[PDB]
Design a protein around this ligand. Structure first.
Ligand SMILES: C[C@H](O)COCC(COC[C@@H](C)O)(COC[C@@H](C)O)COC[C@@H](C)O
Ligand SMILES: [Cl-]
Ligand SMILES: [Cl-]
Ligand SMILES: [Cl-]
Ligand SMILES: [Cl-]
Ligand SMILES: [Cl-]
Ligand SMILES: [Cl-]
Ligand SMILES: [Cl-]
Ligand code: NI
Ligand code: NI
Ligand code: NI
Length: 944
């Protein structure tokens, strides 16, 4: 029996005769975008209004429907959707008959198993499988902490955490991507949550006896207890600061005073042959060895543990020695594992969500990755312009403790002529017992408006922290609570926070606009009136109480406006930021707002928000990981992204020592100076080349002049990259402009610009920063060089020396401490400006246009006032640059557009780099041909 077909204004709806899926709907969303919804019922009305997707079915996109035999074809000018009338499965082809994406079945619905709260009768766990046996690459999915760039053949858990941001937009190496529109925890690859080690492995203790691993408890170096445990688990608190599983009385005290250390020893045995995944969740110091070799070596501060993963091929029956050393230092630990999927499911695309009413996704065709990202922006909203200053240098601290401290640090930068735009006030400016009141403690912040006025008189901006957190004693808590907008379970649980004796606290429910409107009005009345420029919306996972099980985290958010916590687990940040963004629009409809927030989801970019990777650690491995973290965030369609340069929490050896608390580097124990300075030097280098450039963290102090003394190599190196950031502002703000006007992506995985170079896909230590710069951060202590793969199909220039190199090879790039290896793509046209201390000083600046010869080029410099919403009414300009390598001619074309404050006349000089030159980065002094530009096209010829 064949499925019945109904033609609609938006596409078609099939009614399937047999199977769990009763109806399959296709909706045309754009020339390149088709929505697929598989429904285990007859009423599409049960699918909740999307949080990610703001787009509606198109009304101006022609499409055709042809039905013949057992196939129905729906197509637009760019996409063909072929649907089986036998089983309702969909296959997508491009305009030229190429198969991009093929459903392997009609999808799997099954009972919700990860929702601690009562589950609706029409809610299910969902899974959809595509493209079995495909060799494609997969990218995006957001910000993850396991170094993955090409996810193909691996697992990714799309959850929400301090360190992890899920954006369920998937990009293929093929000419498509897809938005999976589900708000609950989602899994790419294996649909199963990782298991305890003994669920699908045989365990043997240190003596070979089956049953569990040998566990040794040491106090200092004295062994206190040995025993065999099937599942060593100290992963979460059940409540307050009490573990679900306490330590034995022999060592419980040692846990509390950090003298405890533990060893696990035994053997593991696969029951099935194939690729197994292992995940070591921990804070404190952990090292794991397999077959006598160290596989993982990690540290995180106790209160912010995470999973550290590896995959390994195992044969059924084989025994492998496992050794773990773990010094908890008050932290957490659990070892997890997944055995191979069934044969046919191992090489395929699989997406699964914990709870939903239907399988609901959007197929997005695109000839380039930029095109695919554009489909994401069309579905979930434009990346609205940040203020230009958001792209300048940010200085932050956990935490500045008074107005004077803020002013003094900003002034110190200005006094040292180190460029800076923004400074940040972290938590705790309010009276101690009044978190949520948004009042300023008179003792430390006596006059918040005077504070803002001084920052502004120094031509800088100030951002201030605001959490979703309220103490029940505050008027603000009470106003929100009276309308049912507070998640009060955390009060019932009596989970006290870390301040003083500890305070009862709750987080509000941002899932209805009525709630977010109140939240906004409160900060409008208390904080916005003082002139603060930006909102640091922290802890928006939400992190109501750290280190509870994820089930408890779900439960704490029940009930909410959209249902259970499990149903919207990944989506908190969007409605929250949106309330603030909409509030700002209603307040001043001509000033760009700015939000920095610690979580995200599809659509976050429509709220004028950047996101950051949260409380990472001052560790090389973390620094390395931030590369994949940013690449995946950008490939998921969210480009304004950043991190704490230097990491958030350093190890104790950095935080104090023989002289007590370490503020300035001068207080470090002598033997810690070198690494502290080197790590920060490398991390500043890296940070200068991510979308937002921001120093932040717990002590030591992170200002450049607190990391090292003036005149030193490291001080000079940090200053040089900060200055370079500003020299590049014409280039960088062009990228900033493109994020909005061209659905642009700033921090680019190599697959974006080298889609046909299969070797480039997997790389997780390099990326393109805009169209010109191949960035290659140094992530190893003491390294003075590193391998750099130069993508094929282009030649490359050493940015610092002018040396030209052929593409399609790996080199050992020179990487002295003072420099990060940087290469420029031939044909690049890079505009720089003069040295400036903050962005507005650079408005209408003289320009140096540097052409990197050897191929044609094209770059249109975007400029506008940098602050207002006028760009939305067309107030902006582009100065088009195009280079023809055959004739050696750079054309500065007719200026497009204009804006209030724009200079009609510009001094522009042009130079060409074709090889080694001593002036490669001497912008001010380089020989260049000068032109007086007045908006009309001029041509500059390369010198013979
Ligand atoms: C000790 C255990 O409760 C962890 O405290 C971590 C903590 C980090 O502060 C970060 C700042 C608010 O941005 C408080 O918890 C923050 C989590 C919940 O995001 C700092 O605790 C400092 C000691 C000295 O009290
Ligand atoms: Cl001066
Ligand atoms: Cl000034
Ligand atoms: Cl100034
Ligand atoms: Cl003002
Ligand atoms: Cl100045
Ligand atoms: Cl100035
Ligand atoms: Cl000035
Ligand atoms: Ni002002
Ligand atoms: Ni100590
Ligand atoms: Ni100035």
């Amino acid at each position: 029996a064949l499925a019945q077909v109904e033609r609609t204004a938006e596409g078609v709806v099939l009614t399937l005769p047999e199977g769990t899926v009763k109806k399959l709907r296709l909706q045309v969303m754009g020339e390149r975008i088709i929505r697929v919804t598989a429904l285990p019922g007859t009423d599409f009305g049960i699918v909740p209004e999307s949080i990610q997707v703001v787009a509606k079915p198109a009304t101006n996109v022609p499409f055709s429907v042809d039905q013949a035999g057992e196939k129905l074809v729906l197509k637009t000018s760019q996409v063909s959707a072929e649907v089986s009338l036998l089983d309702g499965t969909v296959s997508f082809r491009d305009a030229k008959g190429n198969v991009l994406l093929q459903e392997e079945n009609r999808g799997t619905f099954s009972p919700v198993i990860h929702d601690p709260d009562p589950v609706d009768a029409d809610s299910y766990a969902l899974r959809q499988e595509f493209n079995r046996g495909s060799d494609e690459g997969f990218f995006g999915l957001g910000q993850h902490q396991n170094g993955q760039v090409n996810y193909a053949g691996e697992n990714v858990e799309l959850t929400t955490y301090n360190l992890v941001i899920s954006i369920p937009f998937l990009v293929s190496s093929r000419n498509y991507g897809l938005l999976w529109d589900n708000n609950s925890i989602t899994r790419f690859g294996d649909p199963r949550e990782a298991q305890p080690l003994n669920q699908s492995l045989k365990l043997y203790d240190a003596e070979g006896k089956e049953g569990g691993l040998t566990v040794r408890y040491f106090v200092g170096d004295e062994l206190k207890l040995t025993r065999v445990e099937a599942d060593f688990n100290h992963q979460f608190y059940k409540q307050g600061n009490e573990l679900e599983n306490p330590f034995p009385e022999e060592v419980a005290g040692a846990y509390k005073n950090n003298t405890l250390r533990i060893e696990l020893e035994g053997s593991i045995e696969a029951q099935a042959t194939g690729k197994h995944q292992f995940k070591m969740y921990n804070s404190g110091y952990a090292q794991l060895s397999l077959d006598g070799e160290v596989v993982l070596d990690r540290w995180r501060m106790n209160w912010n543990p995470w999973y550290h993963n590896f995959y390994r091929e195992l044969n059924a029956g084989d025994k492998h020695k496992l050794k773990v050393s773990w010094k908890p230092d008050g932290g957490f630990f659990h070892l997890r594992h997944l055995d191979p999927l069934p044969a046919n499911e191992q090489h395929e695309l699989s997406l699964a969500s914990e709870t939903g009413k239907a399988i609901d996704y959007y197929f997005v065709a695109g000839d380039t990755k930029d095109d695919i990202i554009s489909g994401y922006r069309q579905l979930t909203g434009k990346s609205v312009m940040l203020p230009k200053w958001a792209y300048g240098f940010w200085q932050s601290r956990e935490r500045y403790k008074s107005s004077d401290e803020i002013i003094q640090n900003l002034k110190e930068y200005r006094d040292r002529k180190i460029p800076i735009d923004n400074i940040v006030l972290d938590w705790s400016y309010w009276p101690e017992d009044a978190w949520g009141s948004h009042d300023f403690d008179k003792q430390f912040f006596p006059d918040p408006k005077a504070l803002v006025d001084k920052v502004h008189a120094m031509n800088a901006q100030i951002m201030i922290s605001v959490w979703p957190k309220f103490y029940p004693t505050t008027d603000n808590y009470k106003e929100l609570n009276a309308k049912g907008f507070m998640f009060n379970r955390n009060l019932d649980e009596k989970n006290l926070d870390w301040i003083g004796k500890g305070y009862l606290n709750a987080f509000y429910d941002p899932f209805s606009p009525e709630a977010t409107a109140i939240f906004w009005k409160q900060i409008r009345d208390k904080i916005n009136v003082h002139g603060f420029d930006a909102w640091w919306l922290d802890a928006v996972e939400p992190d109501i109480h750290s280190n509870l099980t994820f089930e408890k985290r779900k439960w704490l958010m029940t009930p909410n406006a959209r249902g259970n916590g499990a149903e919207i687990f990944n989506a908190y940040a969007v409605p929250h930021a949106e309330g603030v963004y909409q509030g700002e629009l209603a307040t001043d409809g001509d000033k760009r707002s700015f939000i920095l927030t610690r979580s995200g989801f599809g659509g976050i970019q429509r709220t004028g928000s950047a996101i950051w990777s949260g409380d990472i650690v001052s560790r090389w491995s973390d620094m390395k990981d931030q590369i994949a973290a940013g690449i995946g965030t950008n490939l998921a369609g969210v480009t304004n992204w950043t991190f704490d340069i230097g990491g958030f929490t350093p190890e104790d050896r950095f935080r104090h020592g023989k002289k007590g608390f370490v503020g300035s580097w001068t207080a470090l124990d002598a033997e810690q100076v070198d690494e502290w300075q080197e790590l920060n030097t490398r991390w500043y280098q890296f940070g200068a080349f991510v979308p937002l450039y921001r120093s932040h963290g717990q002590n030591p102090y992170r200002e450049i002049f607190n990391i090292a003394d003036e005149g030193t190599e490291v001080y000079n190196a940090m200053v040089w990259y900060t200055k370079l950031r500003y020299y590049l502002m014409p280039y960088i703000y062009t990228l900033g402009g493109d994020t909005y006007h061209k659905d642009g992506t700033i921090m680019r995985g190599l697959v974006m610009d080298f889609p046909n170079d299969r070797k480039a896909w997997d790389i997780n230590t390099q990326y393109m920063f805009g169209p010109a710069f191949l960035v290659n951060p140094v992530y190893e202590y003491k390294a003075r060089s590193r391998d750099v793969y130069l993508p094929a199909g282009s030649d490359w220039y050493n940015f610092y020396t002018g040396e030209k190199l052929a593409g399609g090879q790996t080199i050992t790039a020179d990487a002295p401490l003072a420099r990060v290896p940087l290469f420029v793509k031939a044909g690049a046209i890079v505009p720089t400006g003069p040295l400036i201390q903050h962005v507005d000083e650079g408005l209408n600046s003289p320009l140096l246009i540097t052409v990197y010869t050897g191929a044609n080029g094209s770059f249109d410099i975007y400029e506008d006032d940098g602050r207002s919403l006028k760009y939305q009414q067309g107030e902006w300009s582009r100065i088009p640059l195009s280079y023809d390598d055959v004739t050696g001619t750079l054309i500065i074309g007719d200026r497009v557009g204009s804006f209030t404050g724009m200079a009609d006349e510009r001094n522009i000089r042009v130079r060409f780099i074709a090889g080694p030159t001593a002036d490669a980065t001497n912008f001010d002094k380089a020989a260049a041909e000068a032109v007086t530009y007045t908006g009309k096209s001029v041509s500059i010829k390369r010198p013979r």
